[PDB]
Amino acid sequence: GMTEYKLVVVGACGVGKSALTIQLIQNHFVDEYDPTIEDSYRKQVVIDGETSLLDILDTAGQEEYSAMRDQYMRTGEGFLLVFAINNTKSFEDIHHYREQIKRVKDVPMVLVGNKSDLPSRTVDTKQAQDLARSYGIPFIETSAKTRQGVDDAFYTLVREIRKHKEK
Ligand SMILES: Nc1nc2c(ncn2[C@@H]2O[C@H](COP(=O)(O)OP(=O)(O)O)[C@@H](O)[C@H]2O)c(=O)[nH]1
Ligand SMILES: *CCC(=O)Nc1ccc(Sc2cc(Br)nc(NCCO)c2)cc1
Ligand SMILES: [Mg+2]
């Protein structure tokens, strides 16, 4: 059989939410994608031997209330909290995005440090590991540019959802 999963990607403007989503649904790096386009995308993959259909909401546009975004998040099964490793403000914003999820939802989440390919790092991996431990969630490093860690981010979120569903 198969299993479907309703996923959401959040994080500051410009961290690579769309780039990560497009690496998952198209397998290449799309470096220019309208920052205002918020939509859900579907991709069938196989995770640990099971056919898995991932619906992914790539959040975008004005950071003002959107009822469709709110209703999708309220019924979302898992969330990626994305920051960019060369942007300290994006990392400092993670708590804000996690609070928004807690206000609308045990919630499966994965902390994602994107843009790992950039040498201009400002957030140490150890800093991010401390934050993910404080939340009780996994931390995964990614590069949407090289595809490093992309399947790890999404598939770890699916594995967290499976654990949650067993409770
Ligand atoms: N070097 C590098 N650039 C990235 C990566 N992910 C995204 N980008 C770039 O970061 C910018 C914002 O990406 P985008 O996907 O639009 O971010 P979003 O606003 O979170 O959807 C664009 O210029 C992308 O080309 C990555 O992993 N590495
Ligand atoms: C630069 C464009 C961009 O990335 N915009 C963007 C980032 C992240 C989100 S997620 C979000 C934002 C806001 Br104001 N509120 C919520 N609340 C939960 C759902 O109602 C989520 C959106 C846009
Ligand atoms: Mg985008």
Swiss-Prot record:
The keyword Membrane applies. Acetylation at Lys-105 prevents interaction with guanine nucleotide exchange factors (GEFs). Lysine-depalmitoylation by SIRT2 promotes its localization to endomembranes in endocytic pathways. Changing G14D: In GASC, JMML and OES; also found in a breast carcinoma cell line; somatic mutation. Keywords: Acetylation, Cardiomyopathy, Cell membrane, Cytoplasm, Deafness, Disease variant, Ectodermal dysplasia, Glycoprotein, GTP-binding, Hydrolase, Intellectual disability, Isopeptide bond, Lipoprotein, Membrane, Methylation, Nucleotide-binding, Palmitate, Prenylation, Proto-oncogene, Ubl conjugation. Disulfide bonds: none annotated. Changing P35L: In NS3; characterized by a defective GTPase-activating protein sensitivity and a strongly reduced interaction with effectors. It is an enzyme of class 3 (hydrolase). InterPro entries: P-loop_NTPase, Small_GTP-bd, Small_GTPase, Small_GTPase_Ras-type. It is a lipid-anchor. Changing L20F: In OES; somatic mutation. GTP binds at residues 11-19, 30-36, 60-61, 114-117. Its EC number is 3.6.5.2. CDD domains: H_N_K_Ras_like. Changing D39A: Decreased interaction with MAPKAP1/SIN1. Changing G61R: In CFC2; characterized by a defective GTPase-activating protein sensitivity and a strongly reduced interaction with effectors. Alternates between an inactive form bound to GDP and an active form bound to GTP. Activated by a guanine nucleotide-exchange factor (GEF) and inactivated by a GTPase-activating protein (GAP). Interaction with SOS1 promotes exchange of bound GDP to GTP. SMART domains: RAB, RAN, RAS, RHO. GO terms for biological process: actin cytoskeleton organization; cardiac muscle cell proliferation; cytokine-mediated signaling pathway; epithelial tube branching involved in lung morphogenesis; female pregnancy; forebrain astrocyte development; gene expression; glial cell proliferation. The modification N-acetylmethionine is found at M2. The modification N6-acetyllysine is found at K105. Ras proteins bind GDP/GTP and possess intrinsic GTPase activity. Plays an important role in the regulation of cell proliferation. Plays a role in promoting oncogenic events by inducing transcriptional silencing of tumor suppressor genes (TSGs) in colorectal cancer (CRC) cells in a ZNF304-dependent manner. It is linked to Leukemia, acute myelogenous: A subtype of acute leukemia, a cancer of the white blood cells. AML is a malignant disease of bone marrow characterized by maturational arrest of hematopoietic precursors at an early stage of development. Clonal expansion of myeloid blasts occurs in bone marrow, blood, and other tissue. Myelogenous leukemias develop from changes in cells that normally produce neutrophils, basophils, eosinophils and monocytes. Leukemia, juvenile myelomonocytic: An aggressive pediatric myelodysplastic syndrome/myeloproliferative disorder characterized by malignant transformation in the hematopoietic stem cell compartment with proliferation of differentiated progeny. Patients have splenomegaly, enlarged lymph nodes, rashes, and hemorrhages. NCBIfam families: small_GTP (TIGR00231). Belongs to the small GTPase superfamily. Ras family. This is GTPase KRas. It comes from Homo sapiens (Human). The gene is KRAS.
